[PDB]
Amino acid sequence: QLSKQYSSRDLPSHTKIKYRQTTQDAPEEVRNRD
Amino acid sequence: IPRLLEDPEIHVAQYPLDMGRKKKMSNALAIQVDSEGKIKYDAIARQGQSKDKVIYSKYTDLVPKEVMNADDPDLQRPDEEAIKEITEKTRVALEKSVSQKVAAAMPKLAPAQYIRYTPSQQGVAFNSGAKQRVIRMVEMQKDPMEPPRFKINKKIPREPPPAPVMHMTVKEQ
Amino acid sequence: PTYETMFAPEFGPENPFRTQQMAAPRNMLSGYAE
Amino acid sequence: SWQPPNVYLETSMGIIVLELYWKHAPKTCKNFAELARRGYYNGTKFHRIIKDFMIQGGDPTGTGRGGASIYGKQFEDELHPDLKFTGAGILAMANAGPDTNGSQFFVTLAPTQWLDGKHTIFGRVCQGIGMVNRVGMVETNSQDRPVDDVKIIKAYPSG
Amino acid sequence: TMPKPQWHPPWKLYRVISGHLGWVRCIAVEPGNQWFVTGSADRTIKIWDLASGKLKLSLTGHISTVRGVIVSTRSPYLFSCGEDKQVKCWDLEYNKVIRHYHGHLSAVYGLDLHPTIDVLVTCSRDSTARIWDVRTKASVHTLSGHTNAVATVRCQAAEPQIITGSHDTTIRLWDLVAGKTRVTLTNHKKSVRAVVLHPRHYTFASGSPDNIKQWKFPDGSFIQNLSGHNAIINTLTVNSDGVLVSGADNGTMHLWDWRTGYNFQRVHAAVQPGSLDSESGIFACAFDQSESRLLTAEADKTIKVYREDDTAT
Amino acid sequence: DEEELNDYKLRKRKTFEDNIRKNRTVISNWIKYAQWEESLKEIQRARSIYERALDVDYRNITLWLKYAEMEMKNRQVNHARNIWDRAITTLPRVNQFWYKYTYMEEMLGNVAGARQVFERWMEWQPEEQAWHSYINFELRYKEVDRARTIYERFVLVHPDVKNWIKYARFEEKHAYFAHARKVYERAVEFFGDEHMDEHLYVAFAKFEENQKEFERVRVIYKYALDRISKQELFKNYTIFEKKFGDRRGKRRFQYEEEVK
Amino acid sequence: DFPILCQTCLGENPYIRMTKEKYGKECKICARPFTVFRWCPGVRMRFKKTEVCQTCSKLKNVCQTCLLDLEYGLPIQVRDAGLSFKDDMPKSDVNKEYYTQNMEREISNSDGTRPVGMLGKATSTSDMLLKLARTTPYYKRNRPHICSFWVKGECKRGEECPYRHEKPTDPDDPLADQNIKDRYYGINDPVADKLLKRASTMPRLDPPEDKTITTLYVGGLGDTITETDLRNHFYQFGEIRTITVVQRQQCAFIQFATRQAAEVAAEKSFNKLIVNGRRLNVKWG
Amino acid sequence: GVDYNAEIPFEKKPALGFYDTSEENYQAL
Ligand SMILES: [Zn+2]
Ligand SMILES: [Zn+2]
Ligand SMILES: [Zn+2]
Secondary structure (H helix, E strand, O other), X not given: OOOOOOOHHHOOOOOOOOOOOOOXXXXXXXXXXX | OOOOOOOOOOOOOOOOOOOOOOOOOOOOOOOOEOOOOOEOOOHHHHOOOOOOOOOOOOHHHHOOOOOOOOOOOOOOOOOHHHHHHHHHHHHHHHHHHHHHXXXXXXXXXXXXXXXXXXXXXXXXXXXXXXXXXXXXXXXXOOOOOOOOOOOOOOOOOOOOOOXXXXXXXXXXX | OOHHHHHOOOOOOOOOOXXXXXXXXXXXXXXXXX | OOOOOOXXXXXXXXXXXXXXXXOOOHHHHHHHHHXXXXXXXXXXXXXXXXXXXXXXXXXXXXXOOOOXXXXXXXXXXXXXXXXXXXXXXXXXXXXXXXXXXXXXXXXXXXXXXXXXXXXXXXXXXXXXXXHHHHHHOOOEOOOOOEOOOOEEEEEXXXX | XXXXXXXXXXXXXXXXXXXXXXXXXXXXXXXXXXXXXXXXXXXXXXXXXXXXXXXXXXXXXXXXXXXXXXXXXXXOEXXXXXXXXXXXXXXXXXXXXXXXXXXXXXXXXXXXXXXXXXXXXXXXXXXXXEEEEOOOOEEEEEEOOOOOOEEEEEEOXXXXXXXXXXXXXXXXXXXXXXXXXXXXXXXXXXXXXXXXXXXXXXXXXXXXXXXXXXXXXOOOOOOOEEOOOOOOOOOEEEOOOOEEEEOOOOOOEEEEEOOOOOEEEXXXXXXXXXXXXXXXOEEXXXXXXXXOEEEEEEOOOEEEEEEEOOOOO | OOOHHHHHHHHHHHHHHHHHHXXXXXXXXXXXXXXXXXXXXXXXXXXXXXXXXXXXXOOOHHHXXXXXXXXXXXXXXXXXXXXXXXXXXXXXXXXXHHHHHHHHXXXXXOHHHHHHHHHHHHOOOOOHHXXXXXXXXXXXXXXXXXXXXXXXXXXXXXXXXHHHHHHHHHHHHOOOHHHHHHHHHHHHHXXXXXXXXXXXXXXXXXXXXXXXXXXXXXXHHHHHHHHOOOOOHHHHHHHHHHHHHHHHOOOOHHHHHHHO | OOOXXXXXXXXXXOEEEEEEEEXXXXXXXXXXXXXXXXXXXXXXXXXXXXXXXXXXXXXXXXXXXXXXXXXXXXXXXHHHHHOOOOOOOOOOHHHXXXXXXXXXXXXXXXXOOOOHHHHHHHOOOOOOHXXXXXXXXXXXXXXXXXXXXXXXXXXXXXXXXXXXXXXXXXXXXXXXXXXXXXXXXXXXXXXXXXXXXXXXXXXXXXXXXXXXXXXXXXXXXOOOOOHHHHHHHHOOOOOEEEEEEEOOOOEEEEEEOOHHHHHHHHHHHOOOOEEOOEEOEEEEX | XXXXXXXXXXXXXXXXXXXXXXXXXXXXX
């Protein structure tokens, strides 16, 4: 029983996930670090 | 010869101890003993649930178990590979669910699908005379300018049997 | 999975316990569908 | 090749002792007794329990479709005019079809007149009637299969 | 004991940092030991240089007390949650909020990230906890269950993915994909405020005012009971060296040998220059990535850093 | 009657529901409602009320007692039996449930049933008093062997000198003096030199005294004392006094030695 | 997916085209939206469509459109008069909503194929209703409704008119009114009451003309039968006293230890028992 | 309105346990 109501807030935004990069500080570096 | 429960050749109705000879429709849910031991009084708690689903009840469960060493195969994180399997299956299942939710945000089905049915009535005069029937299922076309048909707002009041807890001086009072 | 193993008849007595209807193979109450 | 009398079923519930009618049906008696001796029935479950009708066991696979005779696979029935299912605790072989036998057997919980044509009576029980009623009263699912495991632990054939 | 077990060096207080105006409720440390973050009743989130202890950056945007803070490992995000009701995702690339996860009915006490999947788990006073899809801001699952406020939640990769405890004193273990409970433990008499998962052993621990229990995985067999220090205890935290730290509302902190429950050290720490004696006790505390520093968040509006003593024996 | 009574019920009934909905908990509202329907002998309704109250707060022990009580008052033995089982299963620690459960079964006559219950109860390793009640239960019937068996488990569950003494005393009461002696031997053997004191050794002395083994008593008194801690001081004094008494039951040499 | 149906609705054709709407209608009982199914049963038929949601059928064990039991094709009031009224279910408003909700979870946790608690009861049967149960499909039930222009004399579609042209039912007959909710709950159902009146006349159980008499006057024996048929039928009951046999009028008299057993053999027997493929009819004295 | 005085608001028939509740019924007022 799911309503057809909506809201402004809900709509798509930032659908992409910013994965950390290598110089940002990817987990790979972290594991190796002392 | 006996004529009482106390005591095939007899050719008599005999019921030897207590097998019931008249309708009762008794409520009682059979008491059980498992293998060697115990009257399964914990069967009360499970009652609502399936056998599969676990439920702690005996005192033994509560009592501590010791040690297990620095490590043993007994405690370990499933493995890399089990995790990968679990993670992947989980991921797909969730995505399916999400897409349905997201169907709202983004307002077309064309499958003709056949099914073969066995009835439960049978009797040879019920159909023309077929143990089965076949039904072609078709999805009904929805009018895209049709408003929400019916009203969902109505509200009706809200668990499991509680798990056992297993957990004062006058002056303090 | 051989014919001998798969199709061997289920052994021995049949329990009247089930109503003509109860005795039938099922998936969905009213019967079996697939 | 011995026709011993009683057979012993030490089950999880309790111990039941049975009398074989070597008199009427030696082939089936030999089958059952020999399997008992072998330990064939040890660890098996009473896969079907039908309240006020019967208790069926003797299937090492637990499926209701398994088991086999010392005669090899299935064998012939020993039907007899004096052997009818009047009363509880009657021991008989369970037959899918005529003159085909597997170890599986069952114990009556009541008079079952309609069964004569179908089955060969092995004998009769002697001790454990409280036991069989308590087994009979065990909760089962829609398929007559007990929710817990009521198992036979030790079978013995004296004589 | 096994044999007067595992000798660990004592810790000393190394540094005291002021500069919150409210109670510091939460400390988290960044994946590279660069900066550690704090949430406060001040309504700010501050980021501090781990090394020098200087303040790098003050963020503003919560409306009420920030209660919980996490720095993602695999993405450049903070997550924070508050008494406000709001869980926010900050993109540390711009120092602004990019998403907000909406839907708890009361204050959110706690939150945590799944380490591999990309899903966020939160606890609230409203007695539920939620599994949020970080990417779509969506209530994947709602974990009904406890009868009071859920307090601390931890997330793990293996079996029982979600470990949670509440003020109703019972711990439930949640099977993530079902959003249902596998295990209920009821062995604390008073509110469970903190739990912690051991880095290597596959075990977990829970703290209550009365005492601290370890658990086997899954299904939480009982294992041990560490008894000693009795306060309303807000923090449990563990090093790979087997050092378990218990914070408390009365200011006290105790260090424990994870294995044995040997409580090697007791630290009672002075309250800040002004302050009042009653405003003592540590709301929370954490360990840098090197396991060489213990950081505590205190009601006297400070951050204290402890350093393991090198002369020790 | 026919309609006039009915209206009354609506006003009360509706009021009860309103009270519950307003406050939700405050189970005095739940209970009063249950009681009223019980009084009108609408006990199926009453059952549902109690179950609803349990859904709100299953830990509340007054609620459960009122529920079980209601069933018993209406002679609904099997309902009551179910309920009792649930109560002890979910709240095992509550001793009130156990005491009532066994009492009910005893009244019904089901000694076996009661025994079974007590055996379940004992698995929780409860409290001295519970064990006493189990033993006393057995002793309302002859069943002395059963009683002794229970004691054998009890003195290890709660290995307190006093309990051991009590066990021995039990044997004395029923004239199993051979066994009583053995029990004392076991107690002293078990406790060992490491820890034992006054009470047990005194009691053993008293036992042998009553058995008319005066020389043996002196042997025990002396040898066991020297074998262990002696002086603590108060205990020692007590022991000495006991010894003196035994002796009583030229010879005032230690009168001078104690003074000097 | 796929409805729950009578064999009588579904159709007399084995080939059937059946359409589906996701949330088509509210169910007229628990009042929720539910998947609805239409299909054409036959040549002159009406396009039936499911009237109630699948759950409240599993609850009372019935066809979705007819609301007649699966096995017996009997209105619910009947088969409850036949076994067990105490199933119940709240009629009242928000209860109905609540109980439906919970029972919907309970059903969700079942093997799926089983009408919940009733099925534990549903096996033990045959008292009467088997004998009043309907045998063959009844197609007169799917006919199109009565054309209501024509029943005023006017209908201007002529022969084309898909409706049915004939005399309607006199509103006098109490069997007319027939609410749906009513037929569901088993209240004052006219049909069900009629079937109850029909149940009573079954010559059967009163018996007892005389005290202690276990004498059985058996008509319609036939000269194929032996006695041994009789005995091996009747040893189920108990200790026989004796059996008198007459093959000149083919009547067989019987005598049992107790009158109870004779009543039984009547009951079990009357207008039910047949052996040697030939009906064995029974009477007292 | 009739969710009270007609039809038992919401009904929980008690669960049934190892004993016979069939026989029991109760008296009027
Ligand atoms: Zn409905
Ligand atoms: Zn229908
Ligand atoms: Zn017309």
